[PDB]
Amino acid sequence: KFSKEQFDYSLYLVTDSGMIPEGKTLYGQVEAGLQNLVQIREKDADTKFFIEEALQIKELCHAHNVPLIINDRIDVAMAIGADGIHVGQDDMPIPMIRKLVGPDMVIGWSVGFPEEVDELSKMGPDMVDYIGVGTLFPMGTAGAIRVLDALERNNAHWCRTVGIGGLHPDNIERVLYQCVSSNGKRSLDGICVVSDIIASLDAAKSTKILRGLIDKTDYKFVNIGLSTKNSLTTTDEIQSIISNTLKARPLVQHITNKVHQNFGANVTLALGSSPIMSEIQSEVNDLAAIPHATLLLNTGSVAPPEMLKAAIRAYNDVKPIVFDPVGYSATETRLLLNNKLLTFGQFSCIKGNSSEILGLAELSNELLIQATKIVAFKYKTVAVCTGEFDFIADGTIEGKYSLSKGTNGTSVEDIPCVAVEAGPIEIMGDITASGCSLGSTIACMIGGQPSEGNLFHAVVAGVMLYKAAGKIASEKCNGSGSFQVELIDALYRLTRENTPVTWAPKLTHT
Amino acid sequence: KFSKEQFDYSLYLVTDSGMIPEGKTLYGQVEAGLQTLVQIREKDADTKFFIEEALQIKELCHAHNVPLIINDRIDVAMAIGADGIHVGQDDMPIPMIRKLVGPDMVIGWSVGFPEEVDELSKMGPDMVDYIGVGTLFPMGTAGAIRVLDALERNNAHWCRTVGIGGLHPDNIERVLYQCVSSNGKRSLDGICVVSDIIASLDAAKSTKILRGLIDKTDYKFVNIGLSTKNSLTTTDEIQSIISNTLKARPLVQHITNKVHQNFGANVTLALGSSPIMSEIQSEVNDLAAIPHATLLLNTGSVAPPEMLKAAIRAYNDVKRPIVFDPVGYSATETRLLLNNKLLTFGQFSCIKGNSSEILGLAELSNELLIQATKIVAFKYKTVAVCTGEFDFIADGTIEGKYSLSKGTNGTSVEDIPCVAVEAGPIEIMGDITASGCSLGSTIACMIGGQPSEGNLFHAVVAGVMLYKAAGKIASEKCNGSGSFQVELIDALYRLTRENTPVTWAPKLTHT
Amino acid sequence: KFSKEQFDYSLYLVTDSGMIPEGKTLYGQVEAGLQNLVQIREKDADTKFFIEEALQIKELCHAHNVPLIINDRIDVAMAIGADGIHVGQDDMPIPMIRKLVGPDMVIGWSVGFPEEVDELSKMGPDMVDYIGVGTLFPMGTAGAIRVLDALERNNAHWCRTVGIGGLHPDNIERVLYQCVSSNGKRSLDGICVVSDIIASLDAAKSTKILRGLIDKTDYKFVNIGLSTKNSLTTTDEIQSIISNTLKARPLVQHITNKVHQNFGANVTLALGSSPIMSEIQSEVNDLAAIPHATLLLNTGSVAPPEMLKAAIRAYNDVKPIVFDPVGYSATETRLLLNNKLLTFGQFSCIKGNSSEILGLAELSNELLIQATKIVAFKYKTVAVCTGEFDFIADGTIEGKYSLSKGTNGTSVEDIPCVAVEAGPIEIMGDITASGCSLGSTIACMIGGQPSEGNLFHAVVAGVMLYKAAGKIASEKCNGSGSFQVELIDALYRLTRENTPVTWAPKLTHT
Ligand SMILES: Nc1ncnc2c1ncn2[C@@H]1O[C@H](COP(=O)(O)OP(=O)(O)CP(=O)(O)O)[C@@H](O)[C@H]1O
Ligand SMILES: Nc1ncnc2c1ncn2[C@@H]1O[C@H](COP(=O)(O)OP(=O)(O)CP(=O)(O)O)[C@@H](O)[C@H]1O
Ligand SMILES: Nc1ncnc2c1ncn2[C@@H]1O[C@H](COP(=O)(O)OP(=O)(O)CP(=O)(O)O)[C@@H](O)[C@H]1O
Ligand SMILES: Cc1ncsc1CCO
Ligand SMILES: Cc1ncsc1CCO
Ligand SMILES: Cc1ncsc1CCO
Numbered sequence A, C: 001k002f003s004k005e006q007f008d009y010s011l012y013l014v015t016d017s018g019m020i021p022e023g024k025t026l027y028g029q030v031e032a033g034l035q036n037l038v039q040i041r042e043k044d045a046d047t048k049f050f051i052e053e054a055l056q057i058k059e060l061c062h063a064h065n066v067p068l069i070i071n072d073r074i075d076v077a078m079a080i081g082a083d084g085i086h087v088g089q090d091d092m093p094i095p096m097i098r099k100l101v102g103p104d105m106v107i108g109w110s111v112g113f114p115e116e117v118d119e120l121s122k123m124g125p126d127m128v129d130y131i132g133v134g135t136l137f138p139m140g141t142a143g144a145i146r147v148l149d150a151l152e153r154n155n156a157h158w159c160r161t162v163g164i165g166g167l168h169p170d171n172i173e174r175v176l177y178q179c180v181s182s183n184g185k186r187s188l189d190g191i192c193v194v195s196d197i198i199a200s201l202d203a204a205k206s207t208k209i210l211r212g213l214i215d216k217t218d219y220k221f222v223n224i225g226l227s228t229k230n231s232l233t234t235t236d237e238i239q240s241i242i243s244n245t246l247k248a249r250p251l252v253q254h255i256t257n258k259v260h261q262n263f264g265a266n267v268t269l270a271l272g273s274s275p276i277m278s279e280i281q282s283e284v285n286d287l288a289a290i291p292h293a294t295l296l297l298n299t300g301s302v303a304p305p306e307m308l309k310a311a312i313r314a315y316n317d318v319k320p321i322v323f324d325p326v327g328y329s330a331t332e333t334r335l336l337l338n339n340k341l342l343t344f345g346q347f348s349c350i351k352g353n354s355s356e357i358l359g360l361a362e363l364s365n366e367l368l369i370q371a372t373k374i375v376a377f378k379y380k381t382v383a384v385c386t387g388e389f390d391f392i393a394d395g396t397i398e399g400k401y402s403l404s405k406g407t408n409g410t411s412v413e414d415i416p417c418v419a420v421e422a423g424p425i426e427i428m429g430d431i432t433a434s435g436c437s438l439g440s441t442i443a444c445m446i447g448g449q450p451s452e453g454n455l456f457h458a459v460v461a462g463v464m465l466y467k468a469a470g471k472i473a474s475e476k477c478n479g480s481g482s483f484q485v486e487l488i489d490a491l492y493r494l495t496r497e498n499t500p501v502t503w504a505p506k507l508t509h510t
Numbered sequence B: 001k002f003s004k005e006q007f008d009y010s011l012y013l014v015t016d017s018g019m020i021p022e023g024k025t026l027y028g029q030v031e032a033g034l035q036t037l038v039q040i041r042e043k044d045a046d047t048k049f050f051i052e053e054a055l056q057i058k059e060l061c062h063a064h065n066v067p068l069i070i071n072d073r074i075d076v077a078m079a080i081g082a083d084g085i086h087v088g089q090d091d092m093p094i095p096m097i098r099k100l101v102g103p104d105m106v107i108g109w110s111v112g113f114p115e116e117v118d119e120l121s122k123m124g125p126d127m128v129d130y131i132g133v134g135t136l137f138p139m140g141t142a143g144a145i146r147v148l149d150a151l152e153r154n155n156a157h158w159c160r161t162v163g164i165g166g167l168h169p170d171n172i173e174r175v176l177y178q179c180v181s182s183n184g185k186r187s188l189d190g191i192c193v194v195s196d197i198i199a200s201l202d203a204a205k206s207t208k209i210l211r212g213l214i215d216k217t218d219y220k221f222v223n224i225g226l227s228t229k230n231s232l233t234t235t236d237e238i239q240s241i242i243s244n245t246l247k248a249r250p251l252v253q254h255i256t257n258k259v260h261q262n263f264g265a266n267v268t269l270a271l272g273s274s275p276i277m278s279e280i281q282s283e284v285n286d287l288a289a290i291p292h293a294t295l296l297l298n299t300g301s302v303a304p305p306e307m308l309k310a311a312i313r314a315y316n317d318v319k320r321p322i323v324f325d326p327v328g329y330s331a332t333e334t335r336l337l338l339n340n341k342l343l344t345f346g347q348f349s350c351i352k353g354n355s356s357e358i359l360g361l362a363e364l365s366n367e368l369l370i371q372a373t374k375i376v377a378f379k380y381k382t383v384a385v386c387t388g389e390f391d392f393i394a395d396g397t398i399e400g401k402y403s404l405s406k407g408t409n410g411t412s413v414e415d416i417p418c419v420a421v422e423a424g425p426i427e428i429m430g431d432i433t434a435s436g437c438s439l440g441s442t443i444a445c446m447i448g449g450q451p452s453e454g455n456l457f458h459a460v461v462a463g464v465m466l467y468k469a470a471g472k473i474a475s476e477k478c479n480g481s482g483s484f485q486v487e488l489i490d491a492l493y494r495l496t497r498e499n500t501p502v503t504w505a506p507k508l509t510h511t
């Protein structure tokens, strides 16, 4: 026997016999990754060849102290004395299954939505002693969290969790990283690979690899210091962020809709850094390669979800993206298109206005502080919420993740959030590409940071310089038209003078 | 719950959802059908829709007092208080299953070979409390008996049986009828039907029609007297037989190899009947419709199994008689197949072969040929003829009788009527070609002549004399091979027109 | 250099790069069969990869003392100093080629017809120093000989010959065997394999194999003594042929047209041996396997050339066929169908009447003796020519063949030919299947022979017993109809009495 409690879901290898590399058995693979938990899925063979393959492997496994788990069948295992069974949502009811296998056998369940964890919990312990969460990629992380959360809300502590579907080395760290509860108390208990150890020409190696990622603790997703800063941003600091980004001249690639095209192009080389509006898929790897490049990502744009994914990755592969979802919560179509981009990579910063920043937090004023803080954490990013008060929460937690210990209780309630204001300036809401352009700005700051830089300040820097240059234009203008041209000026000037002690905006604490 | 001893396998409906007539449910069909025993096959669906589906039906059955059985899915079975579970030769080991389901519950097993009945028995009672015999048609009856036998050679008296695979109304009586143990003590306990109640646009009526056949007990496969005759054929009888076939002038169609083409052509119109040598398919249904038609069937011939099955079926659809001459049952791999295959296309009125061929058909000296003839003629429910120095003529039709699992009231392969027709050494008879093909043409002509009140046995025995008779004569009147043949045909031509069987050379003994 | 005269064409390996078994080079193959002459054919690559592959191999070869020969090119070789070149009929003119490569270089030519050897010879020596004869199988042997003959008729002694196209172990002996001149002086100088050594998984082995066959001397094609008998057949002998074939009961399979079907069936078991008319392809191997089986082959029959080839081979594979070509020289279609069967296997005996026996000899009375003798030799068989005098020539030469030394001068003029007569019996020409039935007879004799038997006498036996039983019937009959039935009798009787001292026919010498 095994005790439910000795079940280590670290790296959970689920098989699919029909996809084995030639000149290699299944026993041959499952052995390799055993030397670096295991379930069997055979939804096709003869339930006798099933029982033979299963016994042959149940013994390999017990030699390594690891248990064995079976699929759609509740006859087989029983008949071969297996350690547990894992059924999908359209397989057999969870009560019936316990009535046969009785207490003492690990029961896996596939959970995609939360109405399912509400069920899972309306059954108590000794039924569903774990679950494999939805199908991340073919819902992604965002959905993984709606679940990890219905767990806490239901205090379902007995049930563990393993992430399943789409997992690879080119995305594992990220799944493990942003797949933490909303309260930060519960993360994922493990990962399920398939086409990664099974279909591998050398499963000795690949299993080592996926181990390297799984029990590391450090997702450095961007080459900029992620340390949690509690102390407001200091004049000397904003000053050096600018001095950096000027000395640096970040190449900021703009994938964006058409209105912001010219505007943001200037707002960029006004900040004294070169811009590139390229929506060509073959370049994305050549650009992201350039010394200080930085990616501005706008939604709505005329570009296809293929090339957006190509870029989000092209940069992540080299370690800093700024993402502007506009609207991202207006129409059905925008809703999708964003959520889909949001599973492609890991973003350095998500900047949105009060509608967008509530939509992402999953639907006033204190509210907007609660909200930015969610979105900052949920997507492990510095989130920015543009308004009369720009709020700037930091949810990156230094790049830390763990298995099922979550984050040392660092909820979506207690992360560093701030406030940048200079009172009523309605006439910033009456220019186009205004928020899109706070993006180009935030973006230039982040790009100019060196390794030892700090990501939070570079954003909090950007939001000042902009709110600052925005108070000015608003004064020196006759309306909208001129407002824009005086804003681009106020930026071109504010920066070359580089004397932050001047700047309009007051920086509070949330 | 049911007691194993309460399962009536009569009509055993095994489902397959993915073939339901539109504007009809499964419940919908399985309800007309319970107006016995039901099994549920879902080798595709979701184990959960499965379970819901299994429950919807378990009630339906229990309402008509009939039980339900699952398939491969032993868990589903347990899970829903299923009455039995039926698994295949490559599904879960029987032991394992009994370990989980434990006694009280029925276990079906798909059997097809005898090696499998042996295993079945080396496990004894309370394990496999019934089997489903192979796939009859896509092996056949021949190989259903091979198992029915191993079952009796292993007194596995607990194990019930059901025939399955290809079972339709155009072949159910034949299957029930010739699927009996070699000792005539055990027959099939019931039938499995699938495509025929389910895909029916009127399951209500298809179930009735399958009842009709299944518990009836009379397969009148040929429109001739099948009574078990025990007294030797009498001269008055062989005389009337001839008088009948002369006066009715039977049509004898000849599917036969190329040498026997002209020979038996004459041997036929020399027996006062007309011969057709047609291997045309379009025709068969037209010919076998002629008032006295009869089919003589040789092998090796150039025609395709397609047309042969076309023809065998043709005549059987109309209860007209078939004569079968399997050339070299073991001659060569290829012929072996061909024949074992045709032997499952219909119900023969007579099988005729030499010693080798009749040892081939009995399934491998002198007393031996009597035993063997009795076997071949019982196995395939027919009057079978082994030719040699002595011709032996066993009757195996048991009067067209069949029953369910009561087999045949203990009438084995050993105590059917077998006789014998010798007239001394005539070596010169096998030294002419188509001699056995031509004994057929004769047997074919004599059965052709028979009317309803006729009698199939005596009619075979008639032709075997007439032949061996004209055999003796031709031999005495020749000077070689070539001359022998022309004296034979002539001997026949004369013998009959004078029809005085008081004269004839050949002595009719008992086996 | 190599001297034309040191060129040993034993086993001539011509390449086709594009058909090499994986994990095996071409160098890798050509080496193997070198350790057990060689030409290169590359009608596709770049004439530079050609020149590299060629040099790489020209050196492998010279290490084994073997020369190298090239294909359609007269530039390459020259450029790579090769030992010879082999051009087809649609390649470059043979004069032009000599004008470039000049004397001293072996020039191969592909010759299929004889108008080509007439050309080949209208050029003298030093041009075409060899030829590869037609394309045997995809014309066959029969055509190989029309050529080997236009050689002699032209006394072209300089030119050697190699057989090419279709050669394999399952037919090599036969090609080498019946491919002898008409005068017996010149046989084939060697064989060309391709898809046999090149495409082989183990070319070490296969090259050994094709060597075993090539420089052996003994084609035992039938399990019956082939010795050349000069002494007429003796009564005691005919007597024992019968005693044998009766004691034996040969299973004689009859593939034949429909008229002879019944007749010959009797004429068979009259000779007290069992007959089988089977035209089913799946049986041919089961029958030919039976203790004393023997094949009767009739033309015209309703059977397809596929199943005829299946049988001719099925028997040859087990070692005795009797072949009756009727007509075989009437219509265009018959003409083909026969010539085609005549390349499928090796026949123990070819029985034909005076039209058929002239047609085969390639178009009176002395003539018919000259003719049967040709056909007997040409197809390395005992040929029988039915007439008023049945002639019986023996052209098997004991199963001997050699490379290019032919047969020790044993022409188509000087083989054992005889004559069986019993004067005018017109009424044998007025029954059907008469010659077809001499076949069934000849056939039963041959079948009953044991290893130590002799094939010539068994035929010469058959032709008596038949001419004998034919004189009788002709006497004891009223016309045709009865003639047949008294003939079948005379055979049934003649044999069981077995007292040859009686028999009508006189056996002369041709
Ligand atoms: N009433 C106000 N008072 C002070 N600043 C304001 C303001 N309204 C807008 N802003 C400033 O302008 C920026 C963006 O404007 P907004 O809140 O409308 O986002 P948005 O996504 O709608 C821009 P777009 O026009 O490209 O869609 C902010 O970052 C903020 O600093
Ligand atoms: N030695 C013998 N003595 C007496 N009768 C014999 C005999 N051999 C054959 N016969 C007779 O000839 C008929 C068939 O004999 P047999 O069975 O040996 O031929 P067969 O089946 O090989 C015919 P085919 O040539 O079509 O294959 C019978 O009616 C039988 O009585
Ligand atoms: N004028 C004659 N005198 C003696 N024998 C003769 C004869 N004419 C035919 N025969 C005999 O009959 C045999 C075959 O007859 P034939 O020479 O016509 O060959 P064939 O191919 O024409 C026969 P088929 O009728 O089957 O086509 C010979 O082997 C020979 O012994
Ligand atoms: C900066 C930029 N990026 C893509 S196009 C473009 C405009 C060239 O002036
Ligand atoms: C008897 C026969 N059968 C088909 S055709 C035929 C020829 C007519 O004498
Ligand atoms: C001898 C023979 N061969 C194939 S059929 C046949 C006729 C069966 O009497």
Ligand SMILES: [Mg+2]
Pocket: A324, A325, A326, A352, A353, A435, A436
């Ligand atoms: Mg915006």
Ligand SMILES: [Mg+2]
Pocket: B325, B327, B353, B354, B435, B436, B437
């Ligand atoms: Mg027979």
Ligand SMILES: [Mg+2]
Pocket: C324, C325, C326, C352, C353, C435, C436
């Ligand atoms: Mg002929």
